[PDB]
Design an enzyme around this catalytic site. Structure first.
Site, PDB file in Angstrom:
ATOM      1  N   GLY A 113     -29.929   1.917   8.458  1.00 17.44           N
ATOM      2  CA  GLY A 113     -31.314   2.329   8.502  1.00 17.44           C
ATOM      3  C   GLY A 113     -31.760   2.599   9.921  1.00 17.44           C
ATOM      4  NE  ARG A 168     -36.591  -5.270   2.831  1.00 15.16           N
ATOM      5  CZ  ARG A 168     -37.870  -5.399   2.505  1.00 15.16           C
ATOM      6  NH1 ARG A 168     -38.257  -5.473   1.242  1.00 15.16           N
ATOM      7  NH2 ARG A 168     -38.784  -5.445   3.470  1.00 15.16           N
ATOM      8  CG  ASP A 172     -31.487  -8.691   8.396  1.00 19.01           C
ATOM      9  OD1 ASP A 172     -30.524  -8.929   9.155  1.00 19.01           O
ATOM     10  OD2 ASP A 172     -31.461  -7.796   7.524  1.00 19.01           O
ATOM     11  CB  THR A 207     -24.917   0.900  10.788  1.00 21.98           C
ATOM     12  OG1 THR A 207     -25.587   2.165  10.871  1.00 21.98           O
ATOM     13  CG2 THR A 207     -23.984   0.910   9.586  1.00 21.98           C
ATOM     14  CG  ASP A 253     -38.509  -7.728   6.987  1.00 25.90           C
ATOM     15  OD1 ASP A 253     -39.210  -7.518   5.973  1.00 25.90           O
ATOM     16  OD2 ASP A 253     -37.571  -6.977   7.330  1.00 25.90           O
ATOM     17  CG  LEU A 288     -21.393  -4.570   4.376  1.00 28.57           C
ATOM     18  CD1 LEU A 288     -21.551  -6.037   4.743  1.00 28.57           C
ATOM     19  CD2 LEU A 288     -20.647  -4.416   3.056  1.00 28.57           C
ATOM     20  N   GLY A 289     -24.765  -1.461   5.003  1.00 31.06           N
ATOM     21  CA  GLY A 289     -26.134  -0.981   5.001  1.00 31.06           C
ATOM     22  C   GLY A 289     -26.462  -0.301   6.310  1.00 31.06           C
TER      23      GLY A 289
HETATM   24  C1  LIG Z   1     -19.857  -7.895   0.483  1.00 30.89           C
HETATM   25  O1  LIG Z   1     -20.839  -8.174   1.468  1.00 30.89           O
HETATM   26  C2  LIG Z   1     -22.086  -7.617   1.304  1.00 30.89           C
HETATM   27  C3  LIG Z   1     -22.231  -6.464   0.482  1.00 30.89           C
HETATM   28  C4  LIG Z   1     -23.459  -5.800   0.218  1.00 30.89           C
HETATM   29  N1  LIG Z   1     -23.599  -4.584  -0.609  1.00 30.89           N
HETATM   30  C5  LIG Z   1     -23.127  -4.668  -2.029  1.00 30.89           C
HETATM   31  C6  LIG Z   1     -23.547  -3.491  -2.937  1.00 30.89           C
HETATM   32  C7  LIG Z   1     -23.775  -2.174  -2.188  1.00 30.89           C
HETATM   33  N2  LIG Z   1     -24.189  -1.088  -3.172  1.00 30.89           N
HETATM   34  C8  LIG Z   1     -23.155  -0.952  -4.237  1.00 30.89           C
HETATM   35  C9  LIG Z   1     -25.494  -1.426  -3.808  1.00 30.89           C
HETATM   36  C10 LIG Z   1     -24.878  -2.408  -1.134  1.00 30.89           C
HETATM   37  C11 LIG Z   1     -24.894  -3.830  -0.514  1.00 30.89           C
HETATM   38  C12 LIG Z   1     -24.537  -6.422   0.896  1.00 30.89           C
HETATM   39  C13 LIG Z   1     -24.402  -7.564   1.704  1.00 30.89           C
HETATM   40  C14 LIG Z   1     -23.191  -8.252   1.959  1.00 30.89           C
HETATM   41  N3  LIG Z   1     -23.101  -9.416   2.845  1.00 30.89           N
HETATM   42  C15 LIG Z   1     -23.765  -9.641   4.123  1.00 30.89           C
HETATM   43  N4  LIG Z   1     -23.238 -10.604   4.958  1.00 30.89           N
HETATM   44  C16 LIG Z   1     -23.855 -10.807   6.152  1.00 30.89           C
HETATM   45  C17 LIG Z   1     -24.973 -10.090   6.631  1.00 30.89           C
HETATM   46  C18 LIG Z   1     -25.485 -10.322   7.742  1.00 30.89           C
HETATM   47  O2  LIG Z   1     -25.690 -11.482   8.147  1.00 30.89           O
HETATM   48  O3  LIG Z   1     -25.755  -9.315   8.645  1.00 30.89           O
HETATM   49  C19 LIG Z   1     -26.229  -9.570   9.931  1.00 30.89           C
HETATM   50  C20 LIG Z   1     -25.295  -9.599  10.978  1.00 30.89           C
HETATM   51  C21 LIG Z   1     -25.705  -9.846  12.285  1.00 30.89           C
HETATM   52  C22 LIG Z   1     -27.046 -10.071  12.584  1.00 30.89           C
HETATM   53  C23 LIG Z   1     -27.974 -10.045  11.549  1.00 30.89           C
HETATM   54  C24 LIG Z   1     -27.579  -9.797  10.231  1.00 30.89           C
HETATM   55  C25 LIG Z   1     -25.502  -9.095   5.733  1.00 30.89           C
HETATM   56  C26 LIG Z   1     -26.718  -8.248   6.103  1.00 30.89           C
HETATM   57  C27 LIG Z   1     -27.830  -8.643   6.854  1.00 30.89           C
HETATM   58  N5  LIG Z   1     -28.770  -7.605   6.966  1.00 30.89           N
HETATM   59  C28 LIG Z   1     -28.312  -6.498   6.246  1.00 30.89           C
HETATM   60  C29 LIG Z   1     -28.899  -5.225   6.049  1.00 30.89           C
HETATM   61  C30 LIG Z   1     -28.223  -4.300   5.282  1.00 30.89           C
HETATM   62  C31 LIG Z   1     -26.979  -4.636   4.721  1.00 30.89           C
HETATM   63  C32 LIG Z   1     -26.415  -5.882   4.923  1.00 30.89           C
HETATM   64  C33 LIG Z   1     -27.047  -6.872   5.691  1.00 30.89           C
HETATM   65  N6  LIG Z   1     -24.886  -8.889   4.528  1.00 30.89           N
END
Ligand SMILES: COc1cc(N2CCC(N(C)C)CC2)ccc1Nc1ncc(C(=O)Oc2ccccc2)c(-c2c[nH]c3ccccc23)n1
Ligand SMILES: [Cl-]
Ligand SMILES: [Cl-]
Length: 270
Positions: A22, A142, A156, A26, A138, A19-20
């Site tokens: 940096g 986003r 985050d 990851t 932060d 999903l992301g």
């Molecule tokens: C279908 O699900 C998704 C998809 C997309 N995409 C869609 C489009 C893509 N293109 C096409 C543009 C890029 C993006 C983003 C987000 C989520 N759902 C999600 N759920 C839960 C967490 C989350 O709680 O994570 C954590 C886990 C543990 C500890 C702390 C945080 C996160 C999350 C938290 N911080 C991040 C930093 C980077 C990426 C994701 C996260 N995201």
């Protein structure tokens, strides 16, 4: 309360999709499959880079317990942790992605009541963090996630324990981080939503941000915002941190506006 945090074995979760990524690490889309059960749970897995801090696994787990105690519908809760050479954190999957991408992708079909409701829910989550004496550091569009289109969650935080264009001036100049500096970041976050995902200070280098803030310049008024909405945003960006609104006041003010959304936001086709 240690029971609130599940200690996971590596075989109880699998990574499916990225999903992301940096400098922090990851975030993967994955499935949590606890050994005894017959369930497969959609989760997000953030694996931190190895050897970034001298904190041993014992000190990290104690901090994880705090993140697992967060009990609020608008703040993400730490579901589980896997402590190997790398720290891996597990939370519920937010299937609609982050709110910044959502408003960009749906900028033509978002009304005033949606935007004002998001402002209320984000203020509720931040007010809860302040009640727990926790500074986010932060907050940004986003870092707001969309569980469903009208249910968002702040993510985050605690990972900190440089986003210049979201930081209060005292954070840039003096490295001071308080709940009132979070309010500054909340104002920028609201600005991102009202502009349907514009970049703040677009075209200005991050190294020039402190100087323009000191000269009195601020983010411009979004076209959809009436003066009542913009003045609330502007007060979040006051030099005196204690003169900025409190999150509990932002809850009340944005809740009042959400009762008559077209009075405070002027949107084509709304
Ligand atoms: C279908 O699900 C998704 C998809 C997309 N995409 C869609 C489009 C893509 N293109 C096409 C543009 C890029 C993006 C983003 C987000 C989520 N759902 C999600 N759920 C839960 C967490 C989350 O709680 O994570 C954590 C886990 C543990 C500890 C702390 C945080 C996160 C999350 C938290 N911080 C991040 C930093 C980077 C990426 C994701 C996260 N995201
Ligand atoms: Cl929508
Ligand atoms: Cl971006």
């Amino acid at each position: 309360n240690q029971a609130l945090l599940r200690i996971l074995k590596e075989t109880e979760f699998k990574k499916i999709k990225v999903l992301g990524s940096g400098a922090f690490g990851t975030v993967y889309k994955g499935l949590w499959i606890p050994e005894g059960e017959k369930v497969k749970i959609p989760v997000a897995i953030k694996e931190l880079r190895e050897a970034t801090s001298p904190k041993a696994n014992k000190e990290i787990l104690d901090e994880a317990y705090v993140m697992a105690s967060v009990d609020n519908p608008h703040v993400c809760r730490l579901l589980g942790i896997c402590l190997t050479s790398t720290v891996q954190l597990i939370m519920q999957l937010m299937p609609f992605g982050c709110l910044l991408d959502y408003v960009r992708e749906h900028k033509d079909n978002i009304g005033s009541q949606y935007l004002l409701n998001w402002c209320v829910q984000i203020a509720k989550g931040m007010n809860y963090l302040e009640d727990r004496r926790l500074v986010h550091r932060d907050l940004a569009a986003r870092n707001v996630l969309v569980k469903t289109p009208q249910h968002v969650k702040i993510t985050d935080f605690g990972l900190a324990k440089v986003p210049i264009k979201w930081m209060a001036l005292e954070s840039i100049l003096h490295r001071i981080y308080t709940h009132q500096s979070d309010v500054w970041s909340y104002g920028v976050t609201v600005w991102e939503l009202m502009t349907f995902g514009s970049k703040p200070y677009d075209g200005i280098p991050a190294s020039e941000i402190s100087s323009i803030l000191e000269k009195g310049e601020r983010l411009p008024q979004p076209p959809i915002c009436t003066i009542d909405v913009y003045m609330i945003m502007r007060k979040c960006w006051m030099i005196d941190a204690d003169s900025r609104p409190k999150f509990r006041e932002l809850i009340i003010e944005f809740s009042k506006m959400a009762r008559d959304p077209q009075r405070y936001l002027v949107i084509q086709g709304d």
